[PDB]
Each structure stands twice: as C-alpha cells, then as structure tokens.
C-alpha cells in the first residue's frame, strides 16, 4: 500500500495554450457572409484563476489577415477601370459663389471609348476637389492616382454595412470568457467561463473614434499597457453612449455609359437643389459632461493637482489626421477640432463639425491598387453611438505640470482590441499522470 | 447532476474523477481549405493520444491500472495531500519535466514484459 | 455461403445476427477538392460510432453485453415476435424516439458504475 | 539498447520479435493540397489495418494467438529453421501467395465461431 | 459492374425530387466553362 | 562511369569527377540601365 506506482486517466479536465485557426458563424450580399455556417449555451466555471493578457493575442494578428483577404476577392470580377486616365479639360463648377465650398466641384470634360472600338464617345462630368491634380481658357488634370496603381470600380449592388458575425473555433479547442466588471488590461481574473463561439462583433472601420461598439459597466474605464510610457496608444470606454447626426443634404443624380463590350460605368450627374457642404451635429452639454467624467478617471495616475490640457492633432495624412467612417456608401472626412479644445484645473445647442468628402481611396495602405466609389442618388443620414476614444500623450521635461493629450490612433488594430478582449483561445489535452495504490493483475 | 464541459475544472482530483465522460464526449464533435484544416488538424490529435494509450496495454479502459513503482524522488507528497485538496491544475507543473521519463518506461517495459509471458504460458 | 454486401436485408433478424462482418468491412473502403471533401467525410463518420462504441466498455466485441433493464414501456413483444419474422427495418421505427434516452444511462451509469469497483477491488 | 528506426531489419526473427513498438510508435509522426494529399494519406492506411486488425478478435495486443490450423501444405519448414537463421523479408516470399486465403478463413469463421458460444453461455 | 441481387425489401422511390439531379446539374456548367478558360478572349472584333 | 548499357550506343553517358577543376566566366562591360512607364501603375526596364 505504501509502494504507490502509476496510473493513467483519460478525459481530465487540463489545458494549454496555443493558438490555431478559427472560422465564421452567422445568421443582395456583404463583403463577408456569402457562405459560410449559420449558428449561446454557455457553460459557468467557478473559483479558476487565469492569466489574461490582451496587446499579445493571436486573434486579433488572424482576423486583421482574414478582412483584407475578404476585401480583396469581393472586388476581382468587378470592372477594370484602366482606360480613364486620359487627359481632363476641365473647369470651376458653380462660378461667382460667395459661400464657403468653393474650392469644391470641378466640372472636367473627355472622352471614352463606346462598344463598337472605332467609334468614340464625348461626356460631361463633375469631381471632386481632392482627386484631381493640374498637370504642365481652361487647364488640363488628371486623376490622383494614375501614376502609380491601377484604379478599379466596384460593383455598384454590393453593399457595406456591417453585418455582426461570430468567430468559432474547431473541436479539440474551447475559448476562455473572463466576467469581471473592473478589469484592466494585464491581470488574474477570478470568474471565467466557456464558450463555444462568441457574441456578436461588428467590424466598423474608423479613426480616432469608435462607432457602433459596445457599452461598458457603471464607470468609464482608462486601459493601456504602460501609461507611464508615452509610446503606446491609451484606449478609454464609456457607458453612457453619446449621439451624433451626420447628413449630405444636396441632391443627386446619376448617370451611365458603356466603356467597352459588356462593361459598365457610373458617374456623378449634376445638382438640382442647393449647394451646400456635409456636416456632423452632436449634444455640446452632454459631450462637455462626459470629458469631464473621463478626466476624473484619468487622474488617479498623476497626482491630484496637474493641469490637463486636451488639443489638435499633429500632422499625417488625411487618414489619421481627421474623423473618417462610411456611413451608408459615400466616405467622409471630418475635421474634429471642435472637440478637443480647453483645459483643466482641480478648481441646449449643439456642435457642428465641417466635413469633406473623397472619392478615389487606397485603404489598407497597399501599394498598386486602389478603389473607386460609385455615388448615391438621394440625400444621406445616420445616427450613431459614440462608444470609445483613442488618446495618446507628448513627452515633455522633468519639472512639468501640463500634461497633453492628442486624439491619435491610425493604426487599425486597435479597432478590434477593444471589442475582443475578454477572449482567449486555449487547447485541451485529455491525458493525464498520477499515483495510487493500485496495482494490475497478472 | 452534470455540471457541463470543463465544470470540475476547479474541484478536487478525487471529486473530478468522478465526472470523466463528459469531456470526453465533446472531443470529436478558396475558404473551404480553413474548414478543412481545421478538420483535419482535429484528427491526429484525437489519433496520437488514442495510439498511445493503445500501446499502454490498456486501450479499453478508462481507469489504467500498471506495475512500475513511483520512486518519490520525482515529487513527495503524501495520499491525502493529493486527492483531498489541491486540483489538476497545480498538478501539471510538478509532473511536467518526469514526462518524456514516464512515458518512456512505461511503454518500454512492461508491455514487452508481459507478452512474453503468454506466450511461454500457452506454449504449455 | 456469403450472400455478399447487404444480404440479409430482407432476412430474419436471428438470421442476420449470423452474419456481420461483411457489413463491415465495406465501411472503409479544383476538383481534388470533391475527392477529399469526400474522403475525409467517410472518417470521422467512421470515427464517432469508434468512439461511441469504445466509451460502452465493450470496444472490441461486435455482440456486446451490458447489465441495463429493458423496462417494457418502450416496446412491449414478447422474445418471440421480435427474432423470429421482423427484419431489422421494422425494428427501426419503434425504437427511433427512445435513442438519446438509451445512449444516456447506458453510457453515463454503467462504465461509471464499474470503474469504481475495480479501484477498490485492487486496492485491497 | 533501442537500435533505432527498423533496427533489425537484417536480424533474427525472434531477434525482431523482442523490439517491435518503436517500429509502431513513428507509423503518425495552391500548394497546400499537397501538404494535404499527403497527410489525409497516412490516415486510411493506417486505419485500414486497424480495423482488420480489430475485427480478428485482438484488436488490443500485439502477440495474437488465434486457433486455425497451419496446414503444412502452404509452406514446410521446422521451426528451428525459421526462428533461427533467416529474415522476415525472406519469410514474405513464400507466404505472399495465401495471403487472401489466410485472411479469409482467419477472419469469416472464428469470430463467427467465438460469438455463438458466449451468446448461448451468457444465456444460461 | 459487380451487383448484389435483394429480396423481399420494399422501398418507397421518389422521383422528381430526386437529390442526384440537382448535383450534376451544377456539375455540367462548372465543368461546361472551365473549358473557355484558356481559350481566346475574341474581344477586338465588335467593329 | 555510369551508363545503362554500353554495348547500346542510344543512351547517354554520366561520367562523375573527383577532383574539381575550376572555370572563370566574366563580362566586361558596365551598362547603364534606364526607366520607363509603359501604362497606368506597371513598369518597364530596359538596356541603356
Ligand atoms: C450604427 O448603427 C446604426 C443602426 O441604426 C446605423 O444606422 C442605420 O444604418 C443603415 C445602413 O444601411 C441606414 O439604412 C439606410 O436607410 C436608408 C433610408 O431608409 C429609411 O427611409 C425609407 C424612406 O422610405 C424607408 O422606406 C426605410 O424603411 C425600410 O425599412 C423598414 C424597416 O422597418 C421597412 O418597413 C420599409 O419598408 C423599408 O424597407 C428606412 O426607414 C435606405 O434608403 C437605405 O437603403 C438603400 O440602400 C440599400 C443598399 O443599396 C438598398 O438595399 C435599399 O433598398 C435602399 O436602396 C437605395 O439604393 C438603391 C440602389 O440601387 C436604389 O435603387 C433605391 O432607390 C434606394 O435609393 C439604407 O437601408 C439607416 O438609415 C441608419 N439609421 C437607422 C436609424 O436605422 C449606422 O449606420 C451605424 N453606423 C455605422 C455603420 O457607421
Ligand atoms: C513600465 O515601465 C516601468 C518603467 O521602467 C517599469 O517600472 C519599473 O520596474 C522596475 C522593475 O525591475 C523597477 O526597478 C526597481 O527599482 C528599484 C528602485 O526604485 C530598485 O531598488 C530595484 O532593484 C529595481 O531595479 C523600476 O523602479 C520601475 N520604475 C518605476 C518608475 O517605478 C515597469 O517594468 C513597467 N510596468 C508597470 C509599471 O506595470
Ligand atoms: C546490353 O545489351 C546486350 C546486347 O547484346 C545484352 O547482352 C545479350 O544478352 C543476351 C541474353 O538474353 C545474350 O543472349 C545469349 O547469348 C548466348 C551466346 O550467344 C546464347 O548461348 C544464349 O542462348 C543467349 O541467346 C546475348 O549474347 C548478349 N549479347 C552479348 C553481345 O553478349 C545485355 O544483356 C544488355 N545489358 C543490359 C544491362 O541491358
Ligand atoms: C471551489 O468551489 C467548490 C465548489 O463550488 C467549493 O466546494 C466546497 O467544498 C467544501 C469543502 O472544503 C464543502 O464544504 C462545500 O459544500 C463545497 N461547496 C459546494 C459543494 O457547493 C470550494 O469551497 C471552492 N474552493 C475553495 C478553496 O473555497
Ligand atoms: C476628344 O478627342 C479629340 C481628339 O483629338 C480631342 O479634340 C479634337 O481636337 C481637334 C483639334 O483641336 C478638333 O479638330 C476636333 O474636332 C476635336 N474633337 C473633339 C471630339 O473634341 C478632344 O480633346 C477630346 N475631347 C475631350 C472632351 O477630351
Ligand atoms: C504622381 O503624381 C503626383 C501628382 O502629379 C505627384 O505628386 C506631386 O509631385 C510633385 C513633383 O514635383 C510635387 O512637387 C508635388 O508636391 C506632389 N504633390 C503632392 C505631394 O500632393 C507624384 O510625385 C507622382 N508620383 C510619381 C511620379 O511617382
Ligand atoms: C480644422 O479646423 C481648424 C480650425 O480652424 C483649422 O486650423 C487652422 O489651420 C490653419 C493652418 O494654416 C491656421 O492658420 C489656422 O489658424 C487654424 N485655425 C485656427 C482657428 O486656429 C484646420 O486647418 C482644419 N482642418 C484640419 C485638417 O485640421
Ligand atoms: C423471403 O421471403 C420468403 C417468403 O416470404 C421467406 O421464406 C423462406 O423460404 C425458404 C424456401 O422455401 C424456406 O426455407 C424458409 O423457411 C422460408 N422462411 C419463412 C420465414 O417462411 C424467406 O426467408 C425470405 N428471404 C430469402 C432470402 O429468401
Ligand atoms: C491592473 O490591476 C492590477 C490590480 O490592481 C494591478 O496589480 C496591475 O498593476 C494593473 N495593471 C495595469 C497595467 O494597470
Ligand atoms: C431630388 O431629385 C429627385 C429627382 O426627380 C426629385 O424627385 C426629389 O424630389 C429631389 N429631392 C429629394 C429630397 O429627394
Ligand atoms: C439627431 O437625430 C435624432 C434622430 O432621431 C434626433 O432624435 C435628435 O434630436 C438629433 N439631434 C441630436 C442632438 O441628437
Ligand atoms: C463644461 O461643464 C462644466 C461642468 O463641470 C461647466 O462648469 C463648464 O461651464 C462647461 N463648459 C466649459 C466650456 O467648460
Ligand atoms: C486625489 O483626491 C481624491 C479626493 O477625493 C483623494 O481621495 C485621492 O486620494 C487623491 N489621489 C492622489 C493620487 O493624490
Ligand atoms: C477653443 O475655443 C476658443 C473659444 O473662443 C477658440 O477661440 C479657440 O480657437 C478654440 N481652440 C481650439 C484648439 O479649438
Ligand atoms: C445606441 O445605444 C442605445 C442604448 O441602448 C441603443 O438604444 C441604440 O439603439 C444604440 N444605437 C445603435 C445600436 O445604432
Ligand atoms: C529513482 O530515484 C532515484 C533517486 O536518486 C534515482 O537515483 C533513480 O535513478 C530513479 N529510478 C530508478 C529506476 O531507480
Ligand atoms: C503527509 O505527508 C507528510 C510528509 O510531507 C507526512 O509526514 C505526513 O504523515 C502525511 N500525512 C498526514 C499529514 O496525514
Ligand atoms: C522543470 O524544468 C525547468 C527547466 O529549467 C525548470 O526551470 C523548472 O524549475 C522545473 N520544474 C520542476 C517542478 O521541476
Ligand atoms: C420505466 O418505465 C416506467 C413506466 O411508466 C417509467 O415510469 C420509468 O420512468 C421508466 N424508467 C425507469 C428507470 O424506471
Ligand atoms: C407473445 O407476446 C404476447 C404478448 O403480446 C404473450 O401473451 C404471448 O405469451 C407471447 N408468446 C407466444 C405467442 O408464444
Ligand atoms: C415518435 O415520435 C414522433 C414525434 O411526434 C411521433 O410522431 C411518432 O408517432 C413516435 N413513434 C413511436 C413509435 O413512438
Ligand atoms: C490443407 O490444404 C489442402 C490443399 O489446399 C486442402 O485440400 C485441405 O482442405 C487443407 N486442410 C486444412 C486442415 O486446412
Ligand atoms: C527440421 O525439418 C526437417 C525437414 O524439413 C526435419 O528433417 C528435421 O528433423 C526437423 N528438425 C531439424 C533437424 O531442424
Ligand atoms: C506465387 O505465385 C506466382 C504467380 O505466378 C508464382 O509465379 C510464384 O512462383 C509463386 N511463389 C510461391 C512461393 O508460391
Ligand atoms: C554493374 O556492376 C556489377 C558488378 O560488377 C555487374 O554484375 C553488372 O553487370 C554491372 N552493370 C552494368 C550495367 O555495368
Ligand atoms: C561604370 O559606371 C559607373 C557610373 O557612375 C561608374 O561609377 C563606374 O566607375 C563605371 N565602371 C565600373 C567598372 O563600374
């Protein structure tokens, strides 16, 4: 009895970590659900602690490669738009106008070829200010981005809302839930749970703010890696959302040709209305309300009295350096400097925003390619939750007691640490070593 | 009643080992190729375990039952400070370098230890 | 002599439960992907009734015995209505609303229930 | 001492026959297809054997014994003369014309055999 | 070849929903333009 | 030597050496090279 030896048992509940591939659940067409396996049951654990650790998960390295893929193919069989880079003869749309676009709506003139290839084709047209560019009586442009990729049209039925999807992992894995209230970003976890796949996740694409996202719990939350580092980015969530309206008011019609045999194009027509530019509203005293709750949180990490101070941003491309999102078809750019504006000591109207308008755009950054976006007849709306900000800070000397913030980000992976992060893929392992009294028969 | 997959997963060795099926059961339940290498990648890993405890002489059963000593120089503790309190968990790190050891003369020994012995025994 | 694959379709249940082997060692005998998507679906299909069938402590027999009552309810013949004229596709339909209850308690109770024994019996 | 990979591949039979598992143990161990015709490849084949392996009553072991009759006829040879000096490459030549009459006679009478009496025993 | 001849089975056939059809018919059209792949792209000719 | 059967004069002959004998190959030459865009986003290298 006391000579113990060894036994094996089989089906023990242990595990690993490890990271393998995942795959879609879900339930005209998107980018994302043509096909693939429609769809809770979740499982409650008990005194188990973890070691989570967001910032170094490999979800968010594998589903960042499974968009651009996603993106990409959805836009092979459309048309090739190579033989519009002619040259533009091309003039001010809306002369003698004393409001503010006017720099805007070039009217240019040229022309395309018709199906039969011996015949040509005259057309008029209208662009914006932001895609064409004087080349060396009316002068001559040419498009934004001929020199160096091939520009292709998508297809105008196929649609970019985004539709919530689940990521499921295969059998053989199980996915980790912490359910705690207050957490911040590196840390045990003491009430976890099993899912089989996840909630519902919304892949909206933005820039130095977050729409459509998800709430937190009753206080509003700071989370970065090293805050005392100035180099990483500082993600915050809110509880309560604010609102924000968002419109395009001049009318539109559009207009088609037919470049070669089969294929197909659209343009922008004309305006029948009034000229007008594409705003964005917002609730000044509930914004006003919720940086004052944002900064009562903030200072917990730096004392009680140092001046905070909240200001533009710093430079870059169009991309970063603005308010950017699709809502509904057509891509915006606002500019948002009306909301990072005065300081901080311990002692009914609303908020417009200006906001331009772009057509030809190289999303993802990739060098060769870039796309083109038909326009939409009718006028534009959206409503939306703010859920989220995305704040960095400047260096600075030793003896300081003004500490900034500039509403940063850019990169896009960000977008999706703060919607996956109380998930954790893990790999089970079912056989396991240890000791008794027993002893098998001969 | 069954707590679920994974449900003693903070309960005692000895209560765990009550409640074994059930994690067992679950085990083997352009873009087609990610749906079939994850279904494959399922495979083997269900397969290798399968032909190792095969070769252990006990391939039926749940509950193995072998001859070959402890030799507490590998971990000492006592019986009850191992069944009544502590869970598999904590159990995985002092056992995770002696691994490649036991499986080895396990496998090695006894096996071939035994099939010599029917083999005399039904010669007579 | 071997009527070949599928046989003894029509036959008597007690005369088909004298063959049925041959049944069984038939089971595992761009457009590369329509034969793996094929071949790998013959697997595991193969694989879940393995396992299915080794977790009934009884992996290795084809005419498995356990110790569960019948209990009468379900169907109610006699021994001798039920091996002597039916076939097996009549048997199909009066069993087919009773399976996820007979899989449970033979398979949660039974394995469960003789595991413990043996721990015990060996330990003394 | 653990020669290796196929280590006694020119020794003695009843040599070979002391080392057999680690012959065992490495049987698992656009341009994906490949990767995936090949690894889906190794599966059957060894599922293939498994499964008769499993259907000729031993399914478990290694060392089977079964009772058929070697009827001299096939081969004549002493059993000195076959565990002492030569190979099992050698002893493929002279068998591999039976092969199918051995696998048959083994496999479709003694497990049909085995299972009536267990059956009628049980009964009683 | 190689058939295996039943007795005393009924079954109870249904054609016109039959699952077979709807199979190879897709598999005429996928296999029908795989073929034009390679071949010549006759667009300058529409003159 | 190595062969599949010399009295057949058909096949080939591999003969292996065992000591290297070296061989220098060179071209003298320096070769500007130039640039040009053939169309929208594609390039086009050429001998100068
Ligand atoms: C954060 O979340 C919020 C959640 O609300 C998002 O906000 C919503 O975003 C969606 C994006 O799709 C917006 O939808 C768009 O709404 C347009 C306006 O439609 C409304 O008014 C019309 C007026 O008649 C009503 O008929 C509509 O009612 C429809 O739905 C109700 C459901 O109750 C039905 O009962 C009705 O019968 C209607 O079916 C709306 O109330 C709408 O026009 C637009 O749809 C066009 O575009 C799609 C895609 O092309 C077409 O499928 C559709 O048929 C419409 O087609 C236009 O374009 C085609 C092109 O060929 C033309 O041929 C047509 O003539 C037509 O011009 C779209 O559905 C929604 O308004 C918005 N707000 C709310 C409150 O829901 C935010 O976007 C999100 N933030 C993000 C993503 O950043
Ligand atoms: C974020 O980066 C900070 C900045 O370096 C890190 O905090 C630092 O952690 C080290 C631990 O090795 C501390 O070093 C220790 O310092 C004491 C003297 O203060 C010394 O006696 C010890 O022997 C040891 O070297 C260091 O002080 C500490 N820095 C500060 C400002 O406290 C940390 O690694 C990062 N993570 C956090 C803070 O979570
Ligand atoms: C290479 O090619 C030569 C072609 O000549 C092959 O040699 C020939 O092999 C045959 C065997 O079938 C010899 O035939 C025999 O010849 C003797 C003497 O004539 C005769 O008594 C036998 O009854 C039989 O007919 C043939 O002579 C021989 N030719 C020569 C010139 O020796 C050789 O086998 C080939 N080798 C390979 C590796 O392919
Ligand atoms: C971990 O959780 C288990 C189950 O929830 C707790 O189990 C209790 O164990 C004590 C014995 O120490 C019993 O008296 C209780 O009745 C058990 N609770 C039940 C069955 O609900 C256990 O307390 C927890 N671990 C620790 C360290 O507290
Ligand atoms: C369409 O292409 C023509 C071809 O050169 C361009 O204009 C022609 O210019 C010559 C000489 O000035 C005139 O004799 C022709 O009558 C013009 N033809 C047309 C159709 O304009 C012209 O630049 C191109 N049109 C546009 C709008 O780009
Ligand atoms: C592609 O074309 C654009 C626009 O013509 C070029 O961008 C301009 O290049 C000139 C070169 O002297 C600069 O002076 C301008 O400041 C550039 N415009 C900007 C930065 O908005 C671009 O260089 C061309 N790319 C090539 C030829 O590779
Ligand atoms: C967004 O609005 C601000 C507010 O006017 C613009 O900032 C101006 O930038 C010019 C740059 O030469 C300065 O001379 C002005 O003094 C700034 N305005 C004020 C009130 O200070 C800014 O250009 C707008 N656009 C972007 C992209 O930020
Ligand atoms: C097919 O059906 C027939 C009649 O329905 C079955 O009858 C058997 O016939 C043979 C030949 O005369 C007799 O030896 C058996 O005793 C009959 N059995 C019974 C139950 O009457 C027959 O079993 C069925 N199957 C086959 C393979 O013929
Ligand atoms: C997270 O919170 C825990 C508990 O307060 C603390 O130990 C840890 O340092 C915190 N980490 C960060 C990055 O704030
Ligand atoms: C926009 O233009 C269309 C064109 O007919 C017209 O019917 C419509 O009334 C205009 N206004 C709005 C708000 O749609
Ligand atoms: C924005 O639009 C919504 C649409 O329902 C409206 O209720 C609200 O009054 C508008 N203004 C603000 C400031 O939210
Ligand atoms: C913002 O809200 C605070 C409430 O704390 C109020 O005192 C202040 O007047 C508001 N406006 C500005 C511009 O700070
Ligand atoms: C800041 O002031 C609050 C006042 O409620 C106090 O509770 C807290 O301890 C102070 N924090 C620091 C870091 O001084
Ligand atoms: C902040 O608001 C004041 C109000 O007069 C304005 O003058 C100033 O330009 C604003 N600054 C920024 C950075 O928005
Ligand atoms: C914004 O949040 C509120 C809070 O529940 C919700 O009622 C509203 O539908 C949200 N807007 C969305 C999801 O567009
Ligand atoms: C058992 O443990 C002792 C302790 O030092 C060690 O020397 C020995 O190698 C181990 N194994 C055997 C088989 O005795
Ligand atoms: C537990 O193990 C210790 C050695 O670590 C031993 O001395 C003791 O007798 C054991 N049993 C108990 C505490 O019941
Ligand atoms: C296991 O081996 C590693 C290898 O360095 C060592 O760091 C660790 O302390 C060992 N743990 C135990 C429990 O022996
Ligand atoms: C057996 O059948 C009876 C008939 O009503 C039923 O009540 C009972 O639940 C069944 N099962 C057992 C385990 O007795
Ligand atoms: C057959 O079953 C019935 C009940 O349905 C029973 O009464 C009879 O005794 C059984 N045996 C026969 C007919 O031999
Ligand atoms: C089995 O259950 C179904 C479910 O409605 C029922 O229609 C059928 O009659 C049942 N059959 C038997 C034999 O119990
Ligand atoms: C032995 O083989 C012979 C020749 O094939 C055959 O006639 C005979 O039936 C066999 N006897 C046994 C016992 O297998
Ligand atoms: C071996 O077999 C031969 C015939 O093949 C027989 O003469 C001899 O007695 C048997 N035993 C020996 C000598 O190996
Ligand atoms: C096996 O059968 C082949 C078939 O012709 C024959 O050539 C060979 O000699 C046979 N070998 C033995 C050992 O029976
Ligand atoms: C290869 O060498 C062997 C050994 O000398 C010889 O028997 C054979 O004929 C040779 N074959 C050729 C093709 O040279
Ligand atoms: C070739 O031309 C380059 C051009 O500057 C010159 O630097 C170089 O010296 C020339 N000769 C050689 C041998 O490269």
């Known amino acids: 009895a006391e000579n113990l030896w060894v036994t094996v048992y089989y089906g023990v509940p242990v595990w690993k970590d490890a990271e393998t591939t995942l795959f879609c659940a879900s339930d005209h067409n998107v980018w994302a659900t043509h096909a693939c396996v429609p769809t809770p049951q979740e499982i ?70 018709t199906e039969l290839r011996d015949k040509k084709q005259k057309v008029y047209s209208l662009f914006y200010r932001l895609d064409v560019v004087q080349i060396n009586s009316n002068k001559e442009y040419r498009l934004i981005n001929c020199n160096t990729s091939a520009i292709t049209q998508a297809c105008p039925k196929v649609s970019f ?12 894995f199980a996915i980790l839930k912490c359910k705690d209230k207050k957490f911040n970003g590196t840390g045990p976890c003491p009430s976890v749970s099993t899912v089989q796949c996840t909630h519902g996740i919304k892949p909206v694409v933005s820039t130095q703010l977050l729409l459509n996202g998800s709430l937190a719990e ?23 959302p604010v609102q924000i309206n968002c419109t ?12 070669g045999p089969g294929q197909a194009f659209y343009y922008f027509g004309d305006i029948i209305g009034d000229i007008r530019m594409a705003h964005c509203n917002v609730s000044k005293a509930t914004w006003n309300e919720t940086l004052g709750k944002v900064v009562k949180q903030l200072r ?58 772009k057509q030809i755009i190289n999303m993802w950054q990739r060098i060769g390619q870039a796309m083109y976006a038909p326009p939409i007849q009718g006028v534009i709306r959206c409503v939306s939750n703010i859920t989220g900000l995305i704040l960095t800070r400047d260096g ?34 079912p056989l396991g070593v240890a000791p008794t009294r027993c002893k098998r028969r001969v | 009643v069954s707590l ?26 352009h873009w087609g190729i990610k749906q079939l290498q994850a279904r494959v990648l399922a495979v083997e890993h269900y397969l290798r375990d399968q032909q190792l405890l095969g070769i252990w002489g006990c391939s039926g059963k749940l ?38 050891i036991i499986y080895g003369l396990l496998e090695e020994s006894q096996n071939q230890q035994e099939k010599n012995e029917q083999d005399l025994l039904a010669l007579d």
Not at chain 1, 161 to 172: M, Q
């Open chain 2, 4 to 29: 679920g997959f994974l449900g003693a997963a903070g309960s005692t060795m000895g209560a765990a080992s009550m409640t074994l099926t059930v994690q067992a059961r679950n085990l083997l339940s």
């Open chain 1, 300 to 357: 917990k990490h730096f004392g009680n009295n140092t001046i905070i101070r909240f200001a533009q941003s710093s430079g870059g491309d169009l991309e970063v350096t603005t308010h950017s999102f699709n809502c509904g078809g057509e891509f915006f750019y606002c500019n948002t400097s009306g909301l990072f504006n005065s300081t901080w000591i311990s002692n009914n109207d609303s908020i417009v925003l200006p906001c331009r308008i």
């Open chain 1, 218 to 240: 009753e206080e509003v939350i700071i989370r970065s890696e090293n805050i005392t580092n100035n180099a990483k980015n500082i993600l915050v969530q809110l509880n309560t």
């Open chain 1, 44 to 113: 409650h654990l008990e005194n188990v602690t973890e070691e989570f650790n967001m910032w170094k998960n490999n979800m968010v390295e594998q589903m960042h490669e499974d968009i651009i893929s996603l993106w990409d193919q959805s836009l092979k069989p459309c048309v090739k738009l190579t033989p519009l880079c002619v040259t533009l003869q091309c003039t001010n749309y809306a002369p003698n106008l004393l409001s503010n676009m006017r720099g805007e709506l070039k009217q240019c003139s040229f022309n395309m070829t």
């Open chain 2, 63 to 100: 509950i193995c039952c072998t001859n070959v000593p402890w030799n507490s120089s590998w971990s000492n503790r006592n019986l009850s400070e191992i069944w009544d309190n502590m869970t598999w968990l904590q159990w995985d790190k002092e056992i995770s370098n002696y691994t490649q």
């Open chain 1, 396 to 429: 600075g000397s030793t003896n300081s007691t003004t500490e900034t913030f500039r509403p940063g980000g850019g990169d896009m992976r960000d977008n999706w640490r703060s919607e996956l992060y109380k998930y954790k893929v893990v790999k089970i392992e």
């Open chain 1, 161 to 172: 809302e985004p539709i919530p999807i689940h990521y499921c992992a295969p059998a053989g």
């Open chain 1, 248 to 259: 395009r008011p001049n009318n539109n019609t559009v207009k088609s040709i037919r470049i």
